[PDB]
Amino acid sequence: AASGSALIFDEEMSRYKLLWTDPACEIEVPERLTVSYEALRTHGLAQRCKAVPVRQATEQEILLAHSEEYLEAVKQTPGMNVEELMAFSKKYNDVYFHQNIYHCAKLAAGATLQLVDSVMKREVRNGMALVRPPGHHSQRSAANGFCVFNNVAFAALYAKKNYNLNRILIVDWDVHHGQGIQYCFEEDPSVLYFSWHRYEHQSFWPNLPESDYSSVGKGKGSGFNINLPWNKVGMTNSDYLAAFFHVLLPVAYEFDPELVIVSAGFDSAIGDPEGEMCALPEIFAHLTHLLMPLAAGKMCVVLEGGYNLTSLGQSVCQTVHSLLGDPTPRISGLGTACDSALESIQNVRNVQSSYWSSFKHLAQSETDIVWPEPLKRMPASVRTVVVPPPGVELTLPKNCQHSDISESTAKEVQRIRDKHFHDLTDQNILRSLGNIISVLDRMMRSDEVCNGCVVVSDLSVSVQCALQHALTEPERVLVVYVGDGELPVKTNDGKVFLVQICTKETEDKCVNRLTLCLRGESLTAGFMQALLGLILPVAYEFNPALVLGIVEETARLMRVWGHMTCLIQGLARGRMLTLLQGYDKDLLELTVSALSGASISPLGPLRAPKPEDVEMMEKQRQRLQERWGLLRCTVSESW
Ligand SMILES: COCC(O)(O)CCCCCNCCCN
Ligand SMILES: [K+]
Ligand SMILES: [K+]
Ligand SMILES: [Zn+2]
């Protein structure tokens, strides 16, 4: 029922600045807030967001994560002169105070709570708060790293008290380790904290031993703190996506959070002087997209770091673009993560193996810098086209339409019939192939339609016309097929990759085919492991121009189909055609709901998969990780 996205911002939070010479602090400028909001207005996305006003966090709310002594000390900063502000800033590590910073800190804290309230009251589906100062370094009785009050820690504690939440996921993709959040929920199993950060073997700020992968929590909360250290600079998009596919996402979907809060620091992007990483701003459009199936889309993005004004504006827009449901941009050049990233990923999975069932099999035997500008993201005129069987009226979302076949398309279906299948008069089939071409032409060519779903009766003839027609308009087509037969699909030229979900196991020889024969109780948990750990890594590296989904009528376990078509829309700018053999009102409504960008129901309590399933999946990884390096979650054995 939730509708749009909130953007909480106020110019007042940019009215404090550093007043003395401090080489460690001069990068935290008010222009980070000005450039970020001005970039959203330039791209027209600010106007597309509901501008929820900011408020001050009350004293009672600040004490949720801070002590009375620390709050009382900061409360007297508005009355201090410059010399007194210098002496107060020296008591903490890499932070400066201003006459207006206590005011702005309460606004940054209150703005975060306004976003949490808007999301939890179903007034919006998600949102972002462009706040300042940041927070994830702030501790109970100390300011730290430009942070006065821990904004994200407030949001989690605030959502727990006023909404009785049991599970909250915090994703910290800032380039620094948010040790203030880790200290706050160190013993709390209700708040799962994930953070990657530039570590360089503790040589990078804040130089903390507990910032390493070994800190998994304490007491009842052990296993709910996940640190992923970067021990070398220059981490690429492949490193960031390997962290998501092989660490964060398997844990997040098993956790099943009721609310997702993001410590969105963009100093992990290309060109930032503090992060020195090499990920392009478009990667944040996917980091946001891969998390939105969680918690029915209830996602609160809180601005943290980001100090390259050009890179910051681009990364903010890519985040809001995905939150508004705009199609995700294509990511090319993906491959294996570097050895340092694979070592970090390998170590985190090993330590966490005793806590999460996605890693449980790893525990015993028999297991001036310049970059190109991002392209223009644009939502289609109508996102989804639905073609039900002849004479079936349906209730469609406001951004959907039905199929009329023009005479230009009607002549093509004939030419296809007089050449191939020249003994085909089933006029019902001829209409479906006419629909397939009409929807595909509106997908690939004109920017009017994003994706679509077509109900078919013949499978071999329909998938042939769909696949062959897509390979001639321009390039690369990924095929996801849930059935047991054999389809006229040739994985010969490297232009097609086929993912097959069947019942009987088939010895696969081509490295362009991924066959998943999953055993029937835990078919939901096993499918999600294969989706996050196998299907998504190869699909992202393959980088298709169109996704072709096929479901035969014999196929049942449909609870996972909504998550697949939502996550798989990260490929091919969301251009996905789904062919459903036979009519199923529930399955058709599920496909159209997820294709349209609506939220998906959580999977609930995710159990543990069968050992025979994880064994089959790891044998597929061994067979394919040499060709598709993004599948790797360990360091390669050198000859
Ligand atoms: C969410 O806050 C944004 C941030 O994480 O980027 C803040 C950390 C800056 C602290 C680093 N000081 C420079 C090192 C010189 N000793
Ligand atoms: K982080
Ligand atoms: K925790
Ligand atoms: Zn940072």
Side-chain angles (χ1 to χ4, degrees), residues 7-10 13 52-57 61 104-118 128-132 151 155 300-302:
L7 173 81
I8 292 91
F9 167 74
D10 201 287
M13 280 182 285
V52 174
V54 316
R55 71 168 173 92
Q56 277 193 20
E61 290 163 343
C104 301
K106 299 146 80 195
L107 292 189
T112 310
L113 305 189
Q114 288 288 82
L115 178 52
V116 172
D117 274 323
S118 299
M128 182 179 192
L130 300 178
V131 305
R132 183 172 168 265
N151 303 314
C300 310
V301 175
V302 191

mmCIF file of all heavy atoms in Angstrom, residues 7-10 13 52-57 61 104-118 128-132 151 155 300-302:
data_model
loop_
_atom_site.group_PDB
_atom_site.id
_atom_site.type_symbol
_atom_site.label_atom_id
_atom_site.label_comp_id
_atom_site.label_asym_id
_atom_site.label_seq_id
_atom_site.Cartn_x
_atom_site.Cartn_y
_atom_site.Cartn_z
ATOM 1 N N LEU A 7 12.362 12.229 0.702
ATOM 2 C CA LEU A 7 13.686 12.841 0.709
ATOM 3 C C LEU A 7 13.685 13.928 1.774
ATOM 4 O O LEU A 7 13.091 14.995 1.581
ATOM 5 C CB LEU A 7 14.055 13.407 -0.661
ATOM 6 C CG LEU A 7 15.359 14.208 -0.676
ATOM 7 C CD1 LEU A 7 16.561 13.280 -0.752
ATOM 8 C CD2 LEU A 7 15.370 15.195 -1.827
ATOM 9 N N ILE A 8 14.340 13.651 2.896
ATOM 10 C CA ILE A 8 14.390 14.563 4.030
ATOM 11 C C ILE A 8 15.679 15.367 3.928
ATOM 12 O O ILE A 8 16.775 14.797 3.862
ATOM 13 C CB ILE A 8 14.300 13.803 5.363
ATOM 14 C CG1 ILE A 8 12.913 13.174 5.534
ATOM 15 C CG2 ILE A 8 14.562 14.733 6.516
ATOM 16 C CD1 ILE A 8 12.791 11.768 4.995
ATOM 17 N N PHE A 9 15.549 16.692 3.916
ATOM 18 C CA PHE A 9 16.696 17.569 3.744
ATOM 19 C C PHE A 9 16.340 18.955 4.261
ATOM 20 O O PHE A 9 15.169 19.339 4.304
ATOM 21 C CB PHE A 9 17.132 17.631 2.272
ATOM 22 C CG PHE A 9 18.094 18.746 1.966
ATOM 23 C CD1 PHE A 9 19.419 18.668 2.365
ATOM 24 C CD2 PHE A 9 17.672 19.875 1.283
ATOM 25 C CE1 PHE A 9 20.304 19.694 2.086
ATOM 26 C CE2 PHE A 9 18.552 20.904 1.001
ATOM 27 C CZ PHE A 9 19.869 20.813 1.403
ATOM 28 N N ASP A 10 17.371 19.695 4.667
ATOM 29 C CA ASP A 10 17.187 21.079 5.080
ATOM 30 C C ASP A 10 18.504 21.824 4.925
ATOM 31 O O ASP A 10 19.562 21.315 5.305
ATOM 32 C CB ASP A 10 16.681 21.188 6.521
ATOM 33 C CG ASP A 10 16.014 22.523 6.797
ATOM 34 O OD1 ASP A 10 16.733 23.540 6.891
ATOM 35 O OD2 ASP A 10 14.769 22.555 6.910
ATOM 36 N N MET A 13 21.285 22.448 7.889
ATOM 37 C CA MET A 13 22.353 21.524 8.250
ATOM 38 C C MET A 13 23.664 21.815 7.531
ATOM 39 O O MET A 13 24.677 21.183 7.850
ATOM 40 C CB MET A 13 21.917 20.085 7.968
ATOM 41 C CG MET A 13 21.018 19.494 9.040
ATOM 42 S SD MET A 13 20.559 17.784 8.707
ATOM 43 C CE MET A 13 19.346 17.994 7.408
ATOM 44 N N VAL A 52 9.558 15.307 3.199
ATOM 45 C CA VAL A 52 9.156 15.268 4.609
ATOM 46 C C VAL A 52 10.009 16.258 5.398
ATOM 47 O O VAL A 52 11.247 16.236 5.278
ATOM 48 C CB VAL A 52 9.299 13.849 5.162
ATOM 49 C CG1 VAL A 52 9.039 13.825 6.662
ATOM 50 C CG2 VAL A 52 8.355 12.902 4.436
ATOM 51 N N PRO A 53 9.411 17.133 6.204
ATOM 52 C CA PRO A 53 10.203 18.130 6.933
ATOM 53 C C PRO A 53 11.076 17.486 8.001
ATOM 54 O O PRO A 53 10.823 16.373 8.471
ATOM 55 C CB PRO A 53 9.141 19.042 7.565
ATOM 56 C CG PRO A 53 7.848 18.718 6.841
ATOM 57 C CD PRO A 53 7.968 17.280 6.453
ATOM 58 N N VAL A 54 12.125 18.226 8.389
ATOM 59 C CA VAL A 54 13.043 17.789 9.434
ATOM 60 C C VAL A 54 12.577 18.335 10.778
ATOM 61 O O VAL A 54 11.856 19.335 10.853
ATOM 62 C CB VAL A 54 14.489 18.231 9.119
ATOM 63 C CG1 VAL A 54 14.831 17.992 7.668
ATOM 64 C CG2 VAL A 54 14.723 19.699 9.505
ATOM 65 N N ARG A 55 12.992 17.670 11.855
ATOM 66 C CA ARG A 55 12.679 18.113 13.204
ATOM 67 C C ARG A 55 13.896 17.887 14.086
ATOM 68 O O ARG A 55 14.873 17.252 13.684
ATOM 69 C CB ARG A 55 11.451 17.383 13.766
ATOM 70 C CG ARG A 55 11.692 15.918 14.099
ATOM 71 C CD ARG A 55 10.538 15.353 14.912
ATOM 72 N NE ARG A 55 10.644 13.911 15.123
ATOM 73 C CZ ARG A 55 11.225 13.347 16.178
ATOM 74 N NH1 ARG A 55 11.767 14.103 17.124
ATOM 75 N NH2 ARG A 55 11.270 12.026 16.286
ATOM 76 N N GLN A 56 13.839 18.425 15.299
ATOM 77 C CA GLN A 56 14.893 18.213 16.278
ATOM 78 C C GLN A 56 14.605 16.936 17.053
ATOM 79 O O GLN A 56 13.465 16.697 17.465
ATOM 80 C CB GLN A 56 14.990 19.395 17.240
ATOM 81 C CG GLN A 56 15.790 20.573 16.726
ATOM 82 C CD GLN A 56 16.120 21.557 17.829
ATOM 83 O OE1 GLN A 56 16.093 21.209 19.010
ATOM 84 N NE2 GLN A 56 16.428 22.793 17.453
ATOM 85 N N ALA A 57 15.633 16.116 17.239
ATOM 86 C CA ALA A 57 15.510 14.975 18.131
ATOM 87 C C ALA A 57 15.464 15.467 19.571
ATOM 88 O O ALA A 57 16.291 16.285 19.984
ATOM 89 C CB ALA A 57 16.673 14.007 17.928
ATOM 90 N N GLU A 61 15.159 11.239 23.181
ATOM 91 C CA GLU A 61 15.573 10.404 22.059
ATOM 92 C C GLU A 61 17.089 10.318 21.937
ATOM 93 O O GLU A 61 17.615 9.268 21.551
ATOM 94 C CB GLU A 61 14.963 10.935 20.760
ATOM 95 C CG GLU A 61 13.455 10.736 20.670
ATOM 96 C CD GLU A 61 12.811 11.602 19.604
ATOM 97 O OE1 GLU A 61 13.455 12.574 19.153
ATOM 98 O OE2 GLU A 61 11.657 11.314 19.221
ATOM 99 N N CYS A 104 22.515 21.527 14.360
ATOM 100 C CA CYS A 104 22.448 20.665 13.184
ATOM 101 C C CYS A 104 22.470 19.187 13.558
ATOM 102 O O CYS A 104 21.826 18.373 12.886
ATOM 103 C CB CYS A 104 23.599 20.988 12.233
ATOM 104 S SG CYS A 104 23.637 22.704 11.659
ATOM 105 N N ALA A 105 23.194 18.823 14.620
ATOM 106 C CA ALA A 105 23.244 17.424 15.036
ATOM 107 C C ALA A 105 21.869 16.924 15.463
ATOM 108 O O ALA A 105 21.486 15.792 15.147
ATOM 109 C CB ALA A 105 24.257 17.244 16.167
ATOM 110 N N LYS A 106 21.111 17.754 16.184
ATOM 111 C CA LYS A 106 19.749 17.374 16.544
ATOM 112 C C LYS A 106 18.843 17.324 15.321
ATOM 113 O O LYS A 106 17.885 16.543 15.293
ATOM 114 C CB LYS A 106 19.190 18.342 17.587
ATOM 115 C CG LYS A 106 19.978 18.366 18.885
ATOM 116 C CD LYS A 106 19.977 19.750 19.507
ATOM 117 C CE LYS A 106 18.689 20.028 20.254
ATOM 118 N NZ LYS A 106 18.542 21.482 20.549
ATOM 119 N N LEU A 107 19.126 18.143 14.304
ATOM 120 C CA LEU A 107 18.367 18.058 13.061
ATOM 121 C C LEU A 107 18.719 16.793 12.290
ATOM 122 O O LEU A 107 17.829 16.106 11.779
ATOM 123 C CB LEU A 107 18.615 19.296 12.200
ATOM 124 C CG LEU A 107 18.067 20.623 12.730
ATOM 125 C CD1 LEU A 107 18.188 21.716 11.678
ATOM 126 C CD2 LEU A 107 16.621 20.462 13.177
ATOM 127 N N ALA A 108 20.014 16.472 12.193
ATOM 128 C CA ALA A 108 20.423 15.238 11.527
ATOM 129 C C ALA A 108 19.848 14.018 12.232
ATOM 130 O O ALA A 108 19.470 13.036 11.583
ATOM 131 C CB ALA A 108 21.947 15.151 11.464
ATOM 132 N N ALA A 109 19.772 14.063 13.562
ATOM 133 C CA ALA A 109 19.162 12.968 14.307
ATOM 134 C C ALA A 109 17.653 12.940 14.099
ATOM 135 O O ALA A 109 17.068 11.877 13.858
ATOM 136 C CB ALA A 109 19.505 13.091 15.791
ATOM 137 N N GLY A 110 17.004 14.104 14.188
ATOM 138 C CA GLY A 110 15.566 14.158 13.996
ATOM 139 C C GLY A 110 15.142 13.849 12.576
ATOM 140 O O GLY A 110 14.088 13.244 12.357
ATOM 141 N N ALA A 111 15.950 14.258 11.595
ATOM 142 C CA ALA A 111 15.650 13.933 10.205
ATOM 143 C C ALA A 111 15.627 12.426 9.985
ATOM 144 O O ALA A 111 14.775 11.910 9.251
ATOM 145 C CB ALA A 111 16.671 14.596 9.283
ATOM 146 N N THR A 112 16.555 11.702 10.618
ATOM 147 C CA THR A 112 16.565 10.247 10.501
ATOM 148 C C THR A 112 15.308 9.639 11.109
ATOM 149 O O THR A 112 14.724 8.707 10.543
ATOM 150 C CB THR A 112 17.812 9.670 11.173
ATOM 151 O OG1 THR A 112 18.977 10.360 10.704
ATOM 152 C CG2 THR A 112 17.947 8.191 10.853
ATOM 153 N N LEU A 113 14.875 10.154 12.263
ATOM 154 C CA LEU A 113 13.661 9.638 12.886
ATOM 155 C C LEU A 113 12.425 9.966 12.059
ATOM 156 O O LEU A 113 11.481 9.167 12.015
ATOM 157 C CB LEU A 113 13.519 10.190 14.303
ATOM 158 C CG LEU A 113 14.713 9.958 15.233
ATOM 159 C CD1 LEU A 113 14.369 10.356 16.661
ATOM 160 C CD2 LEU A 113 15.180 8.510 15.171
ATOM 161 N N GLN A 114 12.411 11.128 11.400
ATOM 162 C CA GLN A 114 11.305 11.455 10.506
ATOM 163 C C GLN A 114 11.224 10.464 9.354
ATOM 164 O O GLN A 114 10.128 10.087 8.923
ATOM 165 C CB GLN A 114 11.461 12.880 9.976
ATOM 166 C CG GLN A 114 11.190 13.962 11.007
ATOM 167 C CD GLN A 114 9.719 14.086 11.347
ATOM 168 O OE1 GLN A 114 9.189 13.324 12.156
ATOM 169 N NE2 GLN A 114 9.049 15.052 10.728
ATOM 170 N N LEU A 115 12.379 10.028 8.844
ATOM 171 C CA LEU A 115 12.391 9.033 7.777
ATOM 172 C C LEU A 115 11.906 7.680 8.281
ATOM 173 O O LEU A 115 11.158 6.984 7.583
ATOM 174 C CB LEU A 115 13.797 8.917 7.187
ATOM 175 C CG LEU A 115 13.999 7.876 6.086
ATOM 176 C CD1 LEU A 115 12.969 8.063 4.986
ATOM 177 C CD2 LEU A 115 15.408 7.959 5.523
ATOM 178 N N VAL A 116 12.318 7.292 9.491
ATOM 179 C CA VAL A 116 11.875 6.021 10.058
ATOM 180 C C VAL A 116 10.369 6.031 10.280
ATOM 181 O O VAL A 116 9.679 5.040 10.006
ATOM 182 C CB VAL A 116 12.638 5.724 11.363
ATOM 183 C CG1 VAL A 116 12.050 4.507 12.064
ATOM 184 C CG2 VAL A 116 14.107 5.514 11.070
ATOM 185 N N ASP A 117 9.834 7.151 10.772
ATOM 186 C CA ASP A 117 8.396 7.239 11.009
ATOM 187 C C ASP A 117 7.615 7.192 9.702
ATOM 188 O O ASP A 117 6.581 6.520 9.617
ATOM 189 C CB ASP A 117 8.068 8.513 11.787
ATOM 190 C CG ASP A 117 8.196 8.330 13.285
ATOM 191 O OD1 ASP A 117 7.840 7.240 13.784
ATOM 192 O OD2 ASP A 117 8.652 9.273 13.965
ATOM 193 N N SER A 118 8.096 7.892 8.671
ATOM 194 C CA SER A 118 7.394 7.897 7.391
ATOM 195 C C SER A 118 7.360 6.505 6.775
ATOM 196 O O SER A 118 6.367 6.120 6.145
ATOM 197 C CB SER A 118 8.053 8.890 6.433
ATOM 198 O OG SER A 118 8.006 10.209 6.948
ATOM 199 N N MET A 128 15.252 8.566 1.764
ATOM 200 C CA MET A 128 16.635 8.930 2.022
ATOM 201 C C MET A 128 16.675 10.267 2.746
ATOM 202 O O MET A 128 15.856 11.150 2.477
ATOM 203 C CB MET A 128 17.445 9.014 0.721
ATOM 204 C CG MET A 128 18.918 9.342 0.926
ATOM 205 S SD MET A 128 19.847 9.416 -0.615
ATOM 206 C CE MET A 128 21.526 9.443 0.007
ATOM 207 N N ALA A 129 17.630 10.412 3.662
ATOM 208 C CA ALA A 129 17.825 11.644 4.415
ATOM 209 C C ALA A 129 19.223 12.178 4.137
ATOM 210 O O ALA A 129 20.218 11.518 4.457
ATOM 211 C CB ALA A 129 17.626 11.409 5.914
ATOM 212 N N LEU A 130 19.297 13.367 3.539
ATOM 213 C CA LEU A 130 20.571 14.040 3.286
ATOM 214 C C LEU A 130 20.899 14.880 4.513
ATOM 215 O O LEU A 130 20.557 16.060 4.597
ATOM 216 C CB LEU A 130 20.495 14.890 2.024
ATOM 217 C CG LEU A 130 20.180 14.157 0.720
ATOM 218 C CD1 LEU A 130 20.086 15.142 -0.434
ATOM 219 C CD2 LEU A 130 21.228 13.093 0.434
ATOM 220 N N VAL A 131 21.574 14.264 5.478
ATOM 221 C CA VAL A 131 21.821 14.883 6.770
ATOM 222 C C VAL A 131 23.302 15.223 6.905
ATOM 223 O O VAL A 131 24.145 14.782 6.124
ATOM 224 C CB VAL A 131 21.358 13.990 7.937
ATOM 225 C CG1 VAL A 131 19.896 13.619 7.771
ATOM 226 C CG2 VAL A 131 22.231 12.745 8.030
ATOM 227 N N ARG A 132 23.608 16.014 7.929
ATOM 228 C CA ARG A 132 24.955 16.438 8.286
ATOM 229 C C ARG A 132 24.882 17.095 9.660
ATOM 230 O O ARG A 132 23.986 17.913 9.900
ATOM 231 C CB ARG A 132 25.516 17.399 7.236
ATOM 232 C CG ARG A 132 26.942 17.840 7.481
ATOM 233 C CD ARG A 132 27.489 18.628 6.303
ATOM 234 N NE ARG A 132 28.739 19.296 6.649
ATOM 235 C CZ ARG A 132 28.821 20.554 7.068
ATOM 236 N NH1 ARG A 132 27.722 21.288 7.187
ATOM 237 N NH2 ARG A 132 30.002 21.079 7.364
ATOM 238 N N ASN A 151 23.328 8.873 14.191
ATOM 239 C CA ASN A 151 22.007 8.965 13.575
ATOM 240 C C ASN A 151 21.413 7.584 13.318
ATOM 241 O O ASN A 151 20.244 7.330 13.631
ATOM 242 C CB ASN A 151 22.092 9.761 12.272
ATOM 243 C CG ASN A 151 22.659 11.154 12.474
ATOM 244 O OD1 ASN A 151 22.266 11.870 13.396
ATOM 245 N ND2 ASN A 151 23.592 11.544 11.613
ATOM 246 N N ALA A 155 18.015 5.487 14.815
ATOM 247 C CA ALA A 155 16.928 4.941 14.010
ATOM 248 C C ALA A 155 16.583 3.517 14.422
ATOM 249 O O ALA A 155 15.403 3.152 14.487
ATOM 250 C CB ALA A 155 17.303 4.993 12.530
ATOM 251 N N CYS A 300 15.535 2.698 4.774
ATOM 252 C CA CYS A 300 15.864 4.071 5.147
ATOM 253 C C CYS A 300 17.342 4.311 4.861
ATOM 254 O O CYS A 300 18.209 3.708 5.502
ATOM 255 C CB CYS A 300 15.542 4.330 6.618
ATOM 256 S SG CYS A 300 13.880 3.821 7.122
ATOM 257 N N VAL A 301 17.624 5.191 3.906
ATOM 258 C CA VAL A 301 18.987 5.512 3.494
ATOM 259 C C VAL A 301 19.411 6.792 4.201
ATOM 260 O O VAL A 301 18.778 7.841 4.033
ATOM 261 C CB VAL A 301 19.085 5.664 1.968
ATOM 262 C CG1 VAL A 301 20.479 6.107 1.563
ATOM 263 C CG2 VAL A 301 18.717 4.363 1.283
ATOM 264 N N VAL A 302 20.482 6.717 4.986
ATOM 265 C CA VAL A 302 20.970 7.852 5.763
ATOM 266 C C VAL A 302 22.363 8.212 5.267
ATOM 267 O O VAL A 302 23.276 7.378 5.303
ATOM 268 C CB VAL A 302 20.981 7.549 7.270
ATOM 269 C CG1 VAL A 302 21.219 8.825 8.062
ATOM 270 C CG2 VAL A 302 19.672 6.901 7.683
#
